[PDB]
Design a protein around this nucleic acid. Structure first.
Length: 91
DNA sequence: AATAGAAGGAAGTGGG
DNA sequence: TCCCACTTCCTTCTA
């Protein structure tokens, strides 16, 4: 199965949920979720994973925070905004 | 109060 | 056995 950060990067490259997620500065790898439409994207993540329960944004962001230590995704001090690492961006 | 974003400890589930 | 990569649950704090 696909990793959460790759799922998000794939969405950003494809544009298929442009109303739920978008680049802020793609050169830097910063991206931002929609306040009003992020849940639809969280639902898709859960369904792609086949999880038992409905996925929520809160649980999705809980997983996102676990990347902070290893570095694939880091929280940015801006509403609903995160940043991929250069390594993730290159791959 | 109502709403929302952000946080993380702890325990459960998957597939190695 | 025991880590992977989250998922789920619950509670806290700030704005």
């Amino acid at each position: 199965k696909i990793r959460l950060y790759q799922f998000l990067l794939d969405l950003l490259r494809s544009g298929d949920m442009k109303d739920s997620i978008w680049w802020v500065d793609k050169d830097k790898g910063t991206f931002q979720f929609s306040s009003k439409h992020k849940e639809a994207l969280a639902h898709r993540w859960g369904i792609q994973k086949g999880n038992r329960k409905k996925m929520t944004y809160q649980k999705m962001a809980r997983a996102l925070r676990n990347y902070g230590k290893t570095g694939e995704v880091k929280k940015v001090k801006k509403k609903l905004t995160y940043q991929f690492s250069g390594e993730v961006l290159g791959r």
